[PDB]
Symmetry: D2
Subunit: 304 residues, 4 copies
């Protein structure tokens, strides 16, 4: 292994070209992105056999300073004329390999820094502000791209993946976990109605990488729409386990987006412990935080 | 000083009585709370001279175990028939002093664990789910209460405060910071148009503590409404500093809510560093995260 | 309330004047600080009635920029000729009030950023004078409040030193029994628990000048306080955290008669026991509890 | 991809069999572990084609509950008769595959929860056998993957030990010069910087059984790796982080010929210099940089 790079390259751009012309799905009102504020946290990794002596000999002649990579990324956000994080990464990657001919491979991660709208009164009505936004620490979109330089100096994308990270959903009823193995290691009671709390990280891969860029936006798959599929399927489903749930979410995603090749889930179980089961004259209960150990699932659904 | 207690007492209640009948303000659509899910993180502190020997002699005869306080809090959330965190704290406090006659003082903090609604398709339309909610790590409501037992065994509230914590707002334009002291310690340039980014913690105190409880809900001041005042005033104001902004927010709060005695602000400055000032054929710019040192302000506005 | 300031002012200085000549105590090997690397995280807050219109009118005429406060602190760390965080806070506070006549009050917090020695071979193995390890464990703290009086004199109104983030577990020799059992009590009595405490310990001096280090025989080092706490924890068959922190405070006040008080903020993080008995062993297995934690706050006075 | 499991399985055992008889090296005083307190945080992941219908149909018939995996790990820590996290992972993995015939693959991570000795007076000052300090600094790690073959035999396919979270700063004797200067370069060359690195160091054995501790002469302790890194950092006039980690890896492989490779994940956290020159002193003042950090990933092979 031989790579080096720069992480936590925060970059905030105002007035990026808006994303419009997307194709809708029943589960989601998503219709585009205004891009008054477009925030991204980028990580860049680069490799190439010509870098060996920077490790073995202390020779920095072919070292692009990691600080310079930060400058590169931030200056390219200013010149980017596209509309997606996925497209931004392609722009940075192609540009970097063109600039630095001794680099053979580049890997990029971009994570959305999401902002929400806020209310303001002006001119007699209350409406969403075009100026004031709220920083969100909830779920966020992600993108990943790897690009290589070939022997003939052409550049190729070798892997692309988009995602939604940090979605935390609790369904208060309509979930069971029963029928699992009861042996000398089992102390978990069967539960026919639990308040399932899942953390979800959902990643998708396109059949055609061009569709990830937003250039023909009707082919773009938006993290917002993926979120809304997840919440809809969770609601609709009498869940039998998290495994059961995430397969159903993945199937719905692939049905709604035939341009996707596969969808990958990282889920965690954070369901609360029950403290009070019955409340007089109420359907309510009281729960509390569990001990730290958490269940998790890793699972891919493919169009095949 | 002599106190002991329990922190991080998480408690989640389903189907609390809903909060309705509130009085509206222009800056906010807030009209109540459904309370399908009501989450609170409670901290309890207790004191009393009768506790001295638990420290000086190792005598636990009068020690309520901190673990038992956790049970007390969680069981009282199940029996609580009110509609606010402020009212819950009063219920816990009164109940605890009634149970434990050698305790002279109790202090409670309750912090909302907020959940947001999600979309689901069912029966032919998409609508907000009554079952699936999204855990939010953004701003949250707070409450504080201190209660004492007097010589005649009556109980009195000695301080009450409500709040909104963790509000993070960025206004992209329409802010200046100019005209400050320029001396041998000054390297900050004057800026006539900066993207001010503030973190805000806003706390209010009522003229009449009864108004905090929700029993006559038209007198309750909701953290949601306070949030919306903050965003509205930020939008409306050509800010001259954070100090300037927070005074204006506080004045608007006291004007909208004449039942409040005062409002207290803890603000922090997290404004980004500018990297690209001019983008061809655009009003956009690029910014990045600053170094760690952050400005802060602490400021009270009173009805007087 | 009306103040403003700057937080997370990190400042790292190399080769501060060494802290030497400290009175050593039985519990601790501490005898000074080399100060090859001196790291502090400073928070400054200032007030004055003349600041009112910066809030009420947007008038920045009398605003020292918080960014400039950052520069002030970092440049004063470069010119500081003393040997403690406590003395550094006094230097900053006096300098700031002397510079800015419209400021009536200043409050400072300084938190050590601690670095530990590491081994190098140079031959034989010894502590390096160049390579240090950044520690995210316990750290020293200092607090100072200073005011300008009506007669233009300056006065320290509050001073407090401390040790923060000490996390100690004693595997045996601790009990928690005899507490109230009623409808809300589910906790079992335990005659031998592995008490795990977090400790924040703060102390005040009878004479504020003893905090500065200028006469090092009267300086109380956070390193010595740590080693008193572990020594007392070891020696004591504890009956509660309450019981332990009282005895730690008594020992501190006995070792350091120049101190007026010691204040504790403790938390309980004791593990849940999962396996009570292991064939042919003294040992047991435990695991992390649910999040709710007990805490205690207590002052011992000289 | 199809697996599931349990993370943050904390398990604390008292009086594990001590690790003794380790080969000591010049760079490190390490000679074993008392194991009065042994803490590990375990993550388990399992797979098998027979798990498919638990996803596709909601059939829990063949689901070992993740909660039960937690119980499995904690109870096996109570019955473990060995002396390392690496050997504990092997015990859990073999036991789990022997118990659950429908599981084809298991992957384990174990992370040390480290505890440091403290002083007590008992008389004279000495290390306590009862009171320990929880450390949030560097910690040992272990990784193991085991599979069931077509012929029902079990095989370790992957094993890796490590040291995580080592944060080291060298105040002088580091340079970063000679790198590419073009339209995107603003970083100044620096012939004497206080290089601050975070290090995660991982190693693989030629023979997986040397990882278990069963013959302690062949065991490579994370404590020894730490002290090699600080020793090499001290000795080296570094020319980059790249240059440093290569030399640390070379030294590790020379000291431990039983190792097949060492892998590094490094990050740069060097401070920004604020004051270049201090009257009549060697010293300087620095402060924390903006968030973006450099990193390096590199493998050295025996
Ligand atoms: O949904 C669940 N899947 C699981 O595998 C599991 N194990 N314990 N609880 C669980 N819940
Ligand atoms: O709004 C601000 N207030 C301040 O006091 C300040 N100081 N630096 N920047 C600042 N911005
Ligand atoms: O030392 C303790 N003090 C307490 O007050 C307490 N309550 N539960 N456990 C406890 N342990
Ligand atoms: O050691 C370093 N290696 C690098 O690649 C680098 N880039 N900026 N600073 C650096 N320091």
């Amino acid at each position: 292994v031989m790579y080096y790079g720069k992480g936590d390259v925060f970059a905030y751009r105002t007035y990026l070209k808006p994303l419009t012309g997307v194709r809708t799905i029943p589960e989601s009102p998503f219709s585009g992105r205004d891009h008054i504020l477009f925030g991204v946290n980028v990580k860049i990794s680069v490799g190439g056999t010509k870098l060996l002596t920077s490790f073995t000999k202390g020779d920095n002649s072919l070292v692009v300073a990691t600080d310079s990579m930060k400058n590169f990324i931030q200056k390219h956000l200013a010149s980017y004329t596209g509309t997606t994080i996925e497209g931004f990464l392609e722009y940075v990657a192609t540009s970097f390999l063109k600039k630095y001919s001794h680099i053979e491979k580049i890997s990029l991660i971009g994570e959305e820094i999401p902002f929400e709208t806020t209310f303001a009164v002006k001119n007699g009505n209350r409406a969403a502000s075009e100026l004031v936004f709220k920083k969100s620490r909830n779920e966020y979109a992600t993108a990943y791209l790897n690009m290589v330089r070939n022997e003939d100096n052409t550049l190729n994308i070798t892997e692309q993946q988009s995602g939604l990270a940090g979605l935390q959903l609790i369904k208060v009823s309509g979930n069971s976990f029963v029928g699992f193995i009861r042996d000398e290691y089992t102390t978990l009671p069967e539960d026919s109605n639990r308040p399932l709390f899942v953390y979800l990280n959902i990643k998708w891969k396109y059949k055609n990488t061009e569709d990830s860029f937003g250039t023909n936006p009707e082919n773009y798959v938006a993290a917002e729409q993926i979120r809304d599929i997840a919440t809809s399927v969770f609601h609709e489903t009498e869940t039998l386990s998290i495994q059961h749930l995430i397969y159903l979410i993945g199937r719905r995603i692939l049905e709604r987006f035939p341009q996707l090749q596969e969808v990958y889930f990282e889920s965690q179980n954070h369901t609360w412990d029950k403290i009070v089961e019955e409340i007089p004259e109420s359907e309510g209960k009281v729960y509390t935080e569990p001990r730290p150990p958490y269940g998790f699932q890793c699972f891919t659904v493919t169009q095949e």
